[PDB]
Ligand binder design. Sequence first.
Ligand SMILES: NC(=[NH2+])NCCC[C@H](N)C(=O)O
Ligand SMILES: [Mn+2]
Length: 340
Amino acid sequence: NLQTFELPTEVTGCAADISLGRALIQAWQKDGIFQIKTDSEQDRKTQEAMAASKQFCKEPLTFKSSCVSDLTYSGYVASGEEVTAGKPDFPEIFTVCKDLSVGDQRVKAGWPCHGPVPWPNNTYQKSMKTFMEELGLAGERLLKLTALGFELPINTFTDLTRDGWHHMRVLRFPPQTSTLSRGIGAHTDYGLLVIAAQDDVGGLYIRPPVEGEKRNRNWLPGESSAGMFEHDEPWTFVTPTPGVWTVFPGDILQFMTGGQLLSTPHKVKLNTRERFACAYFHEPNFEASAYPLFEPSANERIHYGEHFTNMFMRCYPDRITTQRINKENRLAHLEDLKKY
Ligand SMILES: NC(=[NH2+])NCCC[C@H](N)C(=O)O
Ligand SMILES: [Mn+2]
């Protein structure tokens, strides 16, 4: 059974705040996951986002496929389009990244992944943007409490999430209709926090920390966490529970804390019913460089925007976003943006 916490509206660093940060870290180090209780507005905006999702998914595939961009990875993923560990995942997804128009200087400069969300409609954009502003507030709470539990300056993590690369995967998993029950393969997500909401059907499994088990550093090439431990136990079932979001660490948190926190492996199993979920990613700024918090002398850095772009090219190798990245070689502009 998971732990559920209520976050304070504002995190000031008082002793109850430091206590709470201590407990979240502990929960992460034991269960690899915990729940935060939602208030009425957070819940209402979660239900609106789900309702918008189901509506969008009823639309014919040609319409849904039309919501795609060669500037940004925001938009539609068909069931079967995403690749995990060499195998296609089967949900339909609408990814929402930072919604930047063609009038933004980063977009003008051809920065990779920077571009406008191909929204199906304005009502869907309102619901999604209202949901993510609430998720973002919760992520900043969480990041301040985490740094407090680690006896770090309160702003240690929030300093990297100014204009952060926050994004969300709006997922619809189909019922299991074939021999394959694999919804999404065992993977780790790429930022600091993942905050997820869930319908009543159920199907997400997460892997807790295991003593002495090696966890791949998904930010290195040749240490991809994609597919690791998929058919080895233990795997906790995240029971659908009304009035909560779940939170677990992403790749940046694992790197920065030198493994005190682990980027939680998770997978999804197709159920007898279609299953709706939203996964929110509280990320650093695109130009932020993560650093090891407990090894000052260590030179390792993770330029977060390079990690995001790498990740999203390996998910979507044939998507028009990726083609244009290859065509104009915007990975080179990424190295330029590091220096000029
Ligand atoms: N864009 C994502 N969050 N994808 C999550 C699934 C894992 C992804 N297919 C990978 O290979 O890393
Ligand atoms: Mn995930």
